[PDB]
Ligand binder design. Structure first.
Ligand SMILES: O=C(O)CNC(=O)C(=O)O
Ligand SMILES: [Mg+2]
Ligand code: NI
Ligand SMILES: [Zn+2]
Length: 331
């Protein structure tokens, strides 16, 4: 079995190997990359996403989200308070202000220590979940707006044509902005490109051990767990590396820098934080190997998770027994 310890693998494809996206994902899996739940891909030196980032300041962040924490430093939830619209130039100035800017630090490990010590005492503002793309239309390799769609993959594997679309999303971050522990909708893959700015630190649980994280989460968030049998779908719970280690939960960590891709694999729980002002692009995708994960994915039906239009067909076709309950939670 390749990668039996489930380490995060880093890949350096050549420009030739960068042509065929599906083929390279399959290659990484042949080497055991998916066992970690997360892989890093460093593009060949010849590649670029676009020419420059000098002209992005007029993008609008219609609903910036202030991420307010509750709990203790290593075990907390966050809620999202909606703020007034602002441009990317305005948001960048805010991120760099004395109130929000990254503190002085020695290295990534020192900043990680500071994050986990102090995160709860601040409420950073995240420009998350903005439909759009920063890839140039002329970029032919690993362009996240030109990937094969998940509806086409389902149709190719299973023969059923379905409605829905699959487009990317932009994320503008600042120091301490946080993504809570989650797997993707329908336990899909994700791919995330860090276009510019400061790093993003990731934590990940191997897919074969995801249920260990779920059991800990039920213990640590006992009210939330009574409320919903899949409350990590709400995407609000944080647990620190120290608490994971105290409870024997297998996990790994890595820091993504500008110009690098990360891939999350089906049922790979992940969480993390941004180091300072940055911009990432991400999208979900599928492969043949996903279909069995999609069929078995948990679902939230309590009302909280509320998701896109395109998840309806995935539940309907892959999980017909669960469909009526899930759709009620949508309504
Ligand atoms: O960057 C973020 O805030 C969150 N991203 C992801 O969870 C992802 O790419 O799968
Ligand atoms: Mg602009
Ligand atoms: Ni994700
Ligand atoms: Zn729920």
């Amino acid at each position: 079995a390749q990668n039996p310890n489930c380490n995060i693998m880093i890949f350096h494809p050549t420009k030739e190997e960068f042509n065929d996206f599906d083929k390279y994902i399959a290659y990484m899996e042949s080497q055991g990359a998916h066992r970690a739940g997360l892989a890093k891909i460093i593009p060949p030196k010849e590649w670029k996403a676009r020419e420059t980032y000098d002209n992005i300041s007029e993008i609008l962040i219609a609903t910036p989200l202030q991420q307010v924490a509750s709990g203790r430093a290593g075990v907390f939830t966050q809620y999202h308070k909606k703020k007034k619209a602002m441009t990317v130039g305005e948001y960048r100035h805010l991120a760099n202000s004395k109130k929000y800017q990254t503190p002085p630090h020695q290295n990534f490990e020192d900043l990680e220590r500071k994050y986990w010590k102090n995160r709860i005492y601040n409420s950073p503002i995240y420009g998350a979940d903005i439909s759009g793309s920063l890839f140039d239309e002329n970029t032919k390799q690993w362009n996240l707006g030109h990937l094969g769609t998940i509806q086409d993959l389902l149709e190719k594997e299973c023969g059923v044509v379905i409605e829905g679309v699959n487009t990317p999303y932009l994320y503008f971050g600042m120091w301490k902005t946080t993504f809570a522990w989650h797997t993707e909708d329908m336990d899909l893959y994700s791919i995330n490109y860090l276009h510019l700015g400061e790093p993003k630190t990731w934590y990940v649980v191997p897919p074969e051990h995801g249920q260990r994280l779920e059991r800990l989460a039920r213990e640590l968030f006992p009210g939330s767990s009574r409320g919903c049998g899949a409350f990590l779908r709400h995407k609000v719970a944080l647990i620190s590396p120290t608490v994971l280690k105290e409870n024997g939960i297998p996990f790994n960590r890595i820091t993504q820098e500008a110009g690098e891709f990360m891939v999350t694999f089906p049922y790979g729980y992940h969480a993390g934080f941004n180091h300072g002002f940055n911009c990432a692009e991400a999208i979900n995708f599928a492969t043949p190997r996903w279909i069995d994960y999609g069929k078995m994915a948990s679902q939230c039906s309590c009302g909280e998770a509320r998701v896109t239009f395109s998840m309806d067909a995935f539940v309907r076709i892959l999980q017909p027994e669960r469909y009526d309950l899930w759709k009620r939670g949508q309504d």
